[PDB]
Design a protein around this ligand. Structure first.
Ligand SMILES: CO[C@H](C(=O)O)c1c(C)nc2ccc(Br)cc2c1-c1ccc(Cl)cc1
Ligand SMILES: CO[C@H](C(=O)O)c1c(C)nc2ccc(Br)cc2c1-c1ccc(Cl)cc1
Lengths: 140, 140
């Protein structure tokens, strides 16, 4: 599985929208609570993600997510292409587990991302260790 | 220079606040436009950063930035310690250069972060390549 492949989806919780990007080869996650499922939020999230990792292609489970000119302009600019688990259920589990530790869901979501990315898998490395290892190896 | 060291500061542009985190050993940047310079925004940004990279210690040029219980609770939770260029001027340059390409400053800022992190330095690697190389080497 290519190191440049990400999957991006939205989930709903507490009337709010959680955008979840998963680095496919590693299981590493970035996520953000957005006010609305909009082309503009998606484009913005893509720019942010691409500035941080070498994002080559993005997949989704809802293709209509990527049809706005706003989104296609963000991929154009960042040089991203499209195509055309669930680690989303596990993230939601974690969120429920830490939910009480924070007032705002947005805070709980970042706690859950932290926990997911740092958890030793294979009982081995964490997803946070695997992404860095995968991308460095691909560089050299 | 230890791989776990980050510097975090706020700048002002267009009446808005830009929080800038710099990975010291590599020059890699993460940044975000926040509505207000608040303990809560800083804590939230720290949680997000720590979920993504192995953040051990954070430095700042304004120590009072880190005195709220809100912020100290985020470091406590994420296991971050404190202490007690400018690549901020260069980021501001980039921002001015792409400013016209976007309506919202927040969008321009992410474009500038992208450009900064992908630029081949030493004419060599980009900051995005160096951080991954530094952190992977430190893992193995
Ligand atoms: C960053 O937003 C937090 C939240 O959504 O609950 C928040 C907020 C909004 N207010 C706080 C006030 C005092 C203290 Br002590 C901690 C917080 C916290 C807080 C909650 C959990 C952590 Cl790990 C760090 C800070
Ligand atoms: C994401 O927020 C953008 C901005 O701050 O200017 C935005 C916004 C807010 N609206 C757009 C509407 C149509 C088209 Br085409 C592009 C955009 C864009 C846009 C601007 C630049 C890029 Cl690279 C991608 C999208």
């Amino acid at each position: 599985c290519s190191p440049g492949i990400w999957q991006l989806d939205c989930t709903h919780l507490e009337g709010k929208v959680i955008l979840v990007a998963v680095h496919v080869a590693s299981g590493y996650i970035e996520a953000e609570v957005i006010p609305a499922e909009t082309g503009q939020e998606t484009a913005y999230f893509l720019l942010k993600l691409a500035g941080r990792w070498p994002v080559k292609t993005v997949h989704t489970d809802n293709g209509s997510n990527f049809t706005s000119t706003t989104v296609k302009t963000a991929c154009w600019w960042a040089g991203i292409k499209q195509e055309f688990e669930s680690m989303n259920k596990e993230l939601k589990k974690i969120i429920g587990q830490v939910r009480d530790q924070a007032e705002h869901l947005k805070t709980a979501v970042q706690m859950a991302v932290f926990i997911h990315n740092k958890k030793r898998k294979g009982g081995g490395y964490s997803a946070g260790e695997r992404i860095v290892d995968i991308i460095a190896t691909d560089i050299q």
